[PDB]
Design a binder for this molecule. Sequence first.
Ligand SMILES: O=c1[nH]cnc2c1ncn2[C@@H]1O[C@H](COP(=O)(O)O)[C@@H](O)[C@H]1O
Ligand SMILES: O=c1[nH]cnc2c1ncn2[C@@H]1O[C@H](COP(=O)(O)O)[C@@H](O)[C@H]1O
Ligand SMILES: *Cc1c(COP(=O)(O)OP(=O)(O)O)cnc(C)c1O
Ligand SMILES: *Cc1c(COP(=O)(O)OP(=O)(O)O)cnc(C)c1O
Lengths: 823, 823
Amino acid sequence: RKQISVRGLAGVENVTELKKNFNRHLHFTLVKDRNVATPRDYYFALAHTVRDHLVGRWIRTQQHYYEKDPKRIYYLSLEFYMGRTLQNTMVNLALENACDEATYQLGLDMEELEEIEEDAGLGNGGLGRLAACFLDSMATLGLAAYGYGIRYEFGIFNQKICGGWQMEEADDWLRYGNPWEKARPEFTLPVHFYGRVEHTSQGAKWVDTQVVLAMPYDTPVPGYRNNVVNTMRLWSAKAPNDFNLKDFNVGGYIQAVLDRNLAENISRVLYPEGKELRLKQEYFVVAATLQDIIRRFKSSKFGCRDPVRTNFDAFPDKVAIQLNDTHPSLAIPELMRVLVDLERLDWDKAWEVTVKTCAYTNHTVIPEALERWPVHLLETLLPRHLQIIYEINQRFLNRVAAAFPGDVDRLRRMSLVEEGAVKRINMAHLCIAGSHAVNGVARIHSEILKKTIFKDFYELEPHKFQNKTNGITPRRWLVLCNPGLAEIIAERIGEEYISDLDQLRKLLSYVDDEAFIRDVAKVKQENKLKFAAYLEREYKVHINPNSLFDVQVKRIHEYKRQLLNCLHVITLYNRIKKEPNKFVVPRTVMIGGKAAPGYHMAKMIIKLITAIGDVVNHDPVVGDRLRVIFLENYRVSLAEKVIPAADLSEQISTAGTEASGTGNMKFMLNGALTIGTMDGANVEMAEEAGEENFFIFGMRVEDVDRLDQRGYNAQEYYDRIPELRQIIEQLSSGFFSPKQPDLFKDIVNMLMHHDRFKVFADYEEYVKCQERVSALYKNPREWTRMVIRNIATSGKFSSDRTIAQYAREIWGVEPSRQRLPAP
Amino acid sequence: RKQISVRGLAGVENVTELKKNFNRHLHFTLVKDRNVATPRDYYFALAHTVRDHLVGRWIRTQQHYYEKDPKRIYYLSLEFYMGRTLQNTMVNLALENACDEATYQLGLDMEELEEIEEDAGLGNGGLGRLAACFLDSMATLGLAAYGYGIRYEFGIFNQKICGGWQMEEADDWLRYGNPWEKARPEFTLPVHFYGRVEHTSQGAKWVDTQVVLAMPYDTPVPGYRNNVVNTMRLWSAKAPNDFNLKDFNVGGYIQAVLDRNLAENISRVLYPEGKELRLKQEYFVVAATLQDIIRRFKSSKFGCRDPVRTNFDAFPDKVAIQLNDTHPSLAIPELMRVLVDLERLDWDKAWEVTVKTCAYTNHTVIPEALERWPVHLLETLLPRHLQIIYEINQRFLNRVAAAFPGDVDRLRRMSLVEEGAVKRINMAHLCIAGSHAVNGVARIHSEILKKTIFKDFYELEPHKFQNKTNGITPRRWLVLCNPGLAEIIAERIGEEYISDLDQLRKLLSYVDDEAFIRDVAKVKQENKLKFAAYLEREYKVHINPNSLFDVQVKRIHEYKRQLLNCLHVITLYNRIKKEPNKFVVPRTVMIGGKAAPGYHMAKMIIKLITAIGDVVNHDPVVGDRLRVIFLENYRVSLAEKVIPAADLSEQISTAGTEASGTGNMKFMLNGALTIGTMDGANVEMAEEAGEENFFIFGMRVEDVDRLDQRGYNAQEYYDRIPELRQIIEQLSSGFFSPKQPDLFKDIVNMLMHHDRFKVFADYEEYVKCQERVSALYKNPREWTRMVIRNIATSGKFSSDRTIAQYAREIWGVEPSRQRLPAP
Ligand SMILES: O=c1[nH]cnc2c1ncn2[C@@H]1O[C@H](COP(=O)(O)O)[C@@H](O)[C@H]1O
Ligand SMILES: O=c1[nH]cnc2c1ncn2[C@@H]1O[C@H](COP(=O)(O)O)[C@@H](O)[C@H]1O
Ligand SMILES: *Cc1c(COP(=O)(O)OP(=O)(O)O)cnc(C)c1O
Ligand SMILES: *Cc1c(COP(=O)(O)OP(=O)(O)O)cnc(C)c1O
């Protein structure tokens, strides 16, 4: 027993012990051989050789949190955009240099193998990239945290462009195993759907439920060389498999083969309206988590630390639960029904707990997008939770009456129950009311929350509405994807920046140092060459390495604006062709992101960007002076290839729309210049960088508002501006689509007659700020120094900071970049 | 590359290294530590610590067959009855000693661990056990042998006895997985169902087919200390999972939810009439299997060795296919289809290869069991193979026209299509016609296939009909279950016997030596003591470890006549009550079997068998002289426990009914004397041991036919025998059944009016035999020496001989007990 220990099983940075484990895993773990193995096979030998090291420190970290029993923090997200784990674990564990030497002497190439990894198909965008950033900060800052989500077998679609139209293939990333996860069938747990609630004697009982099972999966998150490793625990839904003879529902009719497949596809796909499945997913991820939580509260030495009920008095002391946007809101009534009904605390002792345990991050501005289930839907698959949301609600509206007596119309606005045709439950209001700290994700967002969206909630409980500005981690997003820029930053000011990003302001001392200024420049010339190379070798084009890499990687939605960028492209194209011998600084325009199935505007925008691409790229006058590439299937591992490469980062949303913008910061720390309207995270970036270092343009929010107030009439702009006029008529006569003239019709009329987002208004000014971009790029010394200024200022944006601001003002816990001993 | 090698990966029988790998797997493979490891957890780390030694010589064995390129033979069977692998892998790998000592030091008990393992639910009976002894023998005699077949998730049922009535529970043995298998998602193959045959130009083209993917798992089977390890490849079904939006079958309707579950439970359930799922399961295994076979033929250094087509000319020199029973039969129409439609050989060359490739083992005697499929089922799901099977039939019936011209009635008796109401295709005739060796399984059984059942085929091709008498393997069924007998046989004659069993004849020189006699009776006393203990500790009873241990462990069918034996037990009962003080040899009668859900006699029988025992084992005058126990959920782990203990082997099937009987042979080998009719396997074991040393009795097969001839009129017996007349009236009045008198009413009538197997005929003489039995028992020295003659004559029944004969006589390859160098 004490002889069965984690202890003599490594020597780490040792090429000869990593070579001997690489050989044990190909053979014994994979049961393959060198006569029969593939690159996929050699990646799982190595994936497994790095994994041994990662779980050793996983074991010791978790033992060390049971024995020190700290406050535990549960990040609850319905999306975890991890993406690729091999190089990151080697960079956070110190093994990259020894893995590379050992594989190299085993006659293979790590860069090959690295590129066989499938991106962890668990996210689709922002909301999820961010949780995965915060897990890296959370593990580095010694915190005792947990990521909890649904594990999606089919990710969210793969993008393929066929005839310049987006096709959605499916992502089965799980296709040859995922070497980084450990399936725990032994901790499967019931999740209860439907039923009826029987009020028996001392409580209600939620009886006659269908059950789905929630099976957990453990993937370990390491911290930047601080020897802790925390946990990502994702839940697969699985059918009871009795459906055969056992139950005597069956035998006679197996049409309960439908429970089975409608059980199993809670875990099967990301999304992608008021659908029974979405709410089955939110309940499911929330329910199986809350048990696993309450379990460690009772179990984690606190069984013996009962002093009263294993008291839920010290439950908020040792637990926090973050509900990242309204997607886990039912963890508030689900916690209340476990406490009230299963344990037995009275309603107010349990409420005390709930509101001192839950905190909620908000990431939406337009009210048209806050969460909202119909009540009949809630009646039908969660009876007792619609009961609880009604009691939470009656109390809350009386609290409001203890505060603004006489105001009726406030009661009929701060209710969790919305009236119309179809009464709903407003999950936003739940979340505010059931928690102790609400925080938006940019200062202008948190403040417009307080000021407009959650105002009445601000007046009754002003103390709650915090803010925590969004952040990126310096590891994946500067050490790991841009090792070259990191190298020279360490040459001047050392490592500490990796684990402490405001230290990068020291770089302003070098602003005029010619060595630094040739070195930052060189590293980008490296990074562009390499991406220009991939732009032939996986997908195809003839990129010029010397052009201005202009990139817009943003979700393809109408407000997000690539239609602005297209008209500026067809303005350049048109210019180059009207005077084929003027010097125009050459540009590589690259746009990427995924439409969203069935949003057809979004789909005509992917078809425009490609047809433009087929004309400008193939016309001979334009030479190599302009090219328009659609980067296909944009995703986290493409993002770390292209962001190192870009020199201009098109941030151009109509102002007032964006909330924040985590990839904005990915371009700034990675030596690009942002052109952008003033909104979301452009503001605290411009503010850190000093506005003159930034290409801010366009209407500001107030100007949007005035235009609305007198009403935007898109024909006036169409009638002033002679270029705009022309490009519109080119779309329309099918200059860009000869076979189908009429093909962009709907994009003409969108523009011409119902632009909710004022493309034509920010036109004139947009191109003039581009002229200011072209014009500076044609003087390499000063452009490279504006870049030094954006980079030495990054600091305000590391997720190690945004997290500390969670730790201290919200979870109430202290971060610590202390090495834990280990291995 | 060349430095990626198996070489430095194991310092085997070394306790200090096995402790090391233990701790690697508990932690790194299971991602568990001693603070949270269960006995399952420690069971799995040990599984894996032993597995590393396995896969290492899997390795070496399989590299060696590729370099050497031997005839490698594919053993196809739809049920592989494996049961627990650990001790069997250690003993075979010689690791048992160092692992026990190792776990002893780690302070774990290996025996507590070895009982966690679930009994590999791939099998059901004889057909399946036979496949597992044959795979052991094929390793030991280093053949390039593959076992192929489906992976059943749900085994078959795990029985429970609730109130003396049988309950089938399900075997979800794969619940916490299986440490001995490697998933190969890499080699997932399509298998097509339904479709339509487009006769296009140079052939036929099977189009519009539904697909079911076969994904394979690999399991290693080790030899007896020879370092060859062979493969067991079991197939699992996986529906294609585009079923969401991709295909445009769906979106609109996902009612092809059904496709994906009707696909999935191909692999789910063992069976357990003309049900499309059996036919889809059988074709499932054939198709996947043969694509692996031809994949390995063209790959296995023969892609280099083409000379013509990568010709199938030499296919029978490198492949042997064994059709174990009629479940694999579409192997003959599927190998033609591939050869003829997919490659392009013509029908007479392709047929040449099939017949020289295919060989067929029959295990049935009664024509009523042979398998037969409606042509309307085969047209619907395999419409192409119905074609091939008719052309196979036509051309075979012209061969028969060659040979017996003028004959009309043989054409129609011999034909593959069968007429009546429901036109059938006779699968046994397919096999004979496209196989080059048809064989039975005991001498008599192969002769009555030659003489009655297949005789018109025996005339056209008398060369075809072989016999290869079954076998039991000495590793698992003597060494493993019985160490104590293993050991004392080894002092006297050495270890070669375990891999050479006929030399157990050497023992016959020690017949009168009292040291052997004594030792030989000591080990049984050991074995009985321990089995007596297991009958209290796991299940409960107060066995008298000195009693004559009478066990019948056979399939609860009428023809298996446990009822016979019950008439005899009730007889013993009645005597001990009539004559309280006469000296009677104390016995403990133990019966065991799984009913067969749906067969109502068998369910009524286990009921008898429990309540006889409720009566007698509680009744005060019988004391401890008689007890009757039912051995619940008989499976392989129970066989290796009760077959070591047994003194009397109850082998009583009506004669003419058995084809063979492998528990028969197991019992002989462990010094248990046989009471038994002159049937099945009993015949050649009587012939080995000498009839003086066998308790033969009851109506020989001749006498059966005579009794049928004139008519078995059971009442005559009732009316001669006063014990028989009495025990019938005891069953009937309710003596055994006082709360429902009338319960055994349908057993009493059966016996009395329509016993298809004549229990009453052999009653008188059966119990006369039984009296001989108890007499000899009451005479140790002469009891214990009959045993010695029996054990010493066991040689003909080691499966090593059955395979050696298959090897030389049907497959065309040489045996060799040579130790591959390795590890
Ligand atoms: O009370 C304990 N003492 C020591 N180690 C523990 C204890 N509880 C859990 N562990 C470790 O904690 C890990 C994570 O467990 P979880 O937090 O319960 O999911 C396990 O793999 C063990 O390594
Ligand atoms: O061409 C080969 N040379 C040497 N060993 C081979 C070759 N092909 C396969 N093997 C071995 O054969 C094993 C089984 O491959 P399979 O029989 O093709 O399924 C591999 O694990 C290797 O050990
Ligand atoms: C960081 C990141 C993101 C986050 O993207 P954005 O906030 O810039 O814009 P929206 O998509 O409009 O929210 C998205 N995708 C990837 C790959 C990534 O690394
Ligand atoms: C050897 C064996 C068998 C085989 O049983 P038999 O061949 O003796 O006769 P039937 O019972 O009629 O098939 C079945 N099950 C186990 C566990 C076993 O070891």
